[model samples]
Each structure stands twice: as C-alpha cells, then as structure tokens.
Target: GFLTAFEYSEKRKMVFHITTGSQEFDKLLGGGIESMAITEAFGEFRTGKTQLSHTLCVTAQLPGAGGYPGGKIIFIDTENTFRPDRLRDIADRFNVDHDAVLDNVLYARAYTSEHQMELLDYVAAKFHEEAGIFKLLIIDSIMALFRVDFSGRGELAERQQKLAQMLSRLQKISEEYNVAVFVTNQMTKPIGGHILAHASTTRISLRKGRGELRIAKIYDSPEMPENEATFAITAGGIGDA
Candidate 1:
C-alpha cells in the first residue's frame, strides 16, 4: 500500500537534520544537521551566507542533533573571504568556548575558479582518507569568481559547463557520504523570455533587510511547501522572523 512520505510509523525512524544557529530558525527548519541531504542557501553580498557557514562549523559539534560530535568541517572559501572572527562570535553564542570552536573548523581559501574545483577534489579524499567522515562541506559563494573570471570570450557556454561539472561533484559527495553540503550563490540577472528557476532539493534566496539584517527565503525545493521563510542574520547566527 502506498502511503504519504511525510508520515512515519513505529517500524520506521525519522531523522531531521538541523543547522546549529537561530533556534527559532532551527525550529522552522525542523531541528538541526540533516545528514543525508544537500542544503543550499544563496544570496547577494553581506547576506549572511558566510556567517551561516561559520555557525554551522560550531553547531554541528553539539550533542543529540545527529551531527558530528566534535567533528570537523571543510570550509572551501573562494574569493579570500574566510574570517575567524565570525566563527568566534558564533561560538560565543553557543557558549562553546571560542578557541575550541575555532579549532574544530577547518578552512581553505581558493583564489581561482580552477583552484576552487581543485580544492573540492582534494578535500573529498580527505573526508575518507585523512579526516575520516566529516560533517559538512561549505563552499561560500560558489560560481561567483568563475562567472567573473571566465566572462568576455564568448565563454558563457564553457563557463556554465565547467560549473555544471563542479555541481555534479558536489551532488556526488552529498549522496555518497551523507554529509551536508551547503553552498552560497551570488545573484544574477534573469535572461531569455522564460527564465527557468530550477531547484533539485532545497534552494534558498537571501537579500538585504533592515539595519544589518539579512532576509532569506526558500526559492524552490521538493521538501519546502511554499517559498517563504523569513530569516535574519545575527552575530550569533541565522534566525527567524
């Protein structure tokens, strides 16, 4: 007999993965680290994507969330945008003893789009080889550098092609290891008569809000019912409206 997928029975157990920030937002998000899915959040500059990345590093270490208990995070920072100070703020919010929180988060900055792809390959091996099963992989602002770098040679096709390849690898890592893969995306102008806003699992869009606040909402996804989840950026982490 076919049944509603959302319904659970005594024979089956459910695991809801939640990110480790903004308890209100976490509640709205159904708890904390979702182990078997890729959660994507994107937006313009200073929209809190980077902050969320740092927050996740510390949040995943908490007990009872099914996240990495004292696990490590691989932060692939493109565009020279990794900040230790933000991680400190997030740690302080969780009362995680600042230095220890920072210690658990691993970081790598990629200067070139080519290097960004290279780093992905490198860290994935480390997840199995050196790191031994990490909790998350964060690529802050994916495709921003590449879209800018590869422009102006009648290269749009080549650029998107390369991007598709990188995204394919991201999907593979997410499914193969059941690790949460979060990425930040920069906004672009919609083109053509029909702009196809596509989404595979979860796609969140963020924009600037009032006074140091960033607003994020889901644009599309199978799991999300509608396209609205008001969110804010805090020194501690991402929260709800």
Candidate 2:
C-alpha cells in the first residue's frame, strides 16, 4: 500500500444520517451528517441552532430512526447554551427514552481557552475508551472563550497559537474515530476566525427567513456545492416550512 487515492475512497466517510424529522431539512442533509467529518454550523439568534442541536441526541440513538444503533453523543459546551429541556421536547417527538438520552450524552461546560483544551483532551480519552460508541460531538459556541481570553493583535496571535495546538487534539479525534464534530458558533472575524474556519471541513450557516421561516445554507464544503434549503419555526420550534 505504497500509493493510493483509492484507499481513501475505499472506506471514505460512512453516513451518520439522523433526521430532525422535517421535510426540507432532510433534503439539505442529503443522507444527513457524515461520520468522520467536521460540520460547522453558525447562525444568529432565532435561527434554531439549539432547536436543531436539541433534536440530534434523540434521533442519533435509535436504529430505524437514525443511522446508528445505540450510538451516543458528546457535547463540549463553551457558552452554556445547551439545554436539557430542549432535549425532552425533541425526545417525545422522536419517542426515545428521556434518562437514556440524558445519560448517553457526555457533556462538558467550558469557560476559558485552557478549559476547552482540557475538555478536548478528556473526550479524546472518552472516545478512545468507547471505541465506536460515540458518533457525534458538539462544541456549541466554539470560539467564544478564545476571543474572550485573548486581546490585542499580539494576544490574537497567542490565541491563534493556542487554538491551533488545542484543536489538533480535537481534529485528530474526528479523523481517528468515525466520529463527526459539529461546531456551533457566533461572532468572530479579523484573525482568530481565519484559522477556526479552516479547521472545519464543512461550514454551514443558519439564518432567519422572515415570517416563521429559517434557512440552512452550506456556504463551504468538500462535497456539497454552496446552496441552502428552507424550514420554519413551529410551535415545537424547528420544523418544515
């Protein structure tokens, strides 16, 4: 096996197709999120980021409903934006057990750049210990702590240095296992984000689409072309438009 692009092609990324149960939303996902990849989803308020985030824990656990059977999820929350109540809302609709959803999701709340570093490392251990039990990892609001912990141009460089070093552990984990990394973020540009954006293989943007409508767009990807689909904010929060 000295030379090959085909070995890369042979066992590429397996699809981890867990649906949020909406119509156009599934169209956007195609077979839904793939295993062994990074999917970065960023959006402003009322964009249903958590509403969608909340659903995955349930859909990802079952067989007939999702791509994995008894697959677990992990979340490294940087901004305390994740919700247990939100999980129950999606749980009953998906009809999975509540404590089971809560139990399977291993979570870590991060406050500083260094804090996130330890978290990334800890889950790397968790993923290794479990082998293939974990399928998804959500870093909700990824860059918040980095931007907050560093300041000035020199500090941004320090932040950049620190980010690259820490993310290597995280990036390695996704590739090592067939696990997918979903990063939800807001507010960054200048220099810090230039590196942050490149780390992700696919960049998806969520936006409010006027009158109960919302849009999910794929602005960058290795496979998908730049395009988007529509969905809506329902009484349950996120739904088919």
Pick by TM-score: which candidate is best? 2
Task: Please provide, for model 1 over 66-130, each residue's C-alpha lDDT reduced to its tens digit, 9 standing for 90 to 100.
Answer: 43344567888876778888878877877778887777777888888788989988877877685
The ten-residue window of minimal lDDT in model 1 covers 190-199
Model 1 ranges off by over 4 Å: 1-16, 64-70, 130-132, 189-200, 221-227
Clashing pairs in model 2, backbone N/Cα/C closer than 3 A: none
**Cα lDDT computed for each candidate against the true fold:** 0.66, 0.72
Q: What's each prediction's TM-score?
A: 0.79, 0.86
Worst 10 residues of 2 by lDDT: 187-196
RMSD of each: 5.3, 3.2
Per-residue alpha-carbon lDDT of candidate 2 for residues 79-187, written as tens digits (9 for 90 to 100):
7778887777667766767888899898889988898988887888988886878988888767778878886667666788888886676677887787877777773
Q: Candidate 2, residue 141: CA error in Å?
A: 1.1
Q: Report the C-alpha displacement of residue 129, candidate 2, in angstroms.
A: 0.9
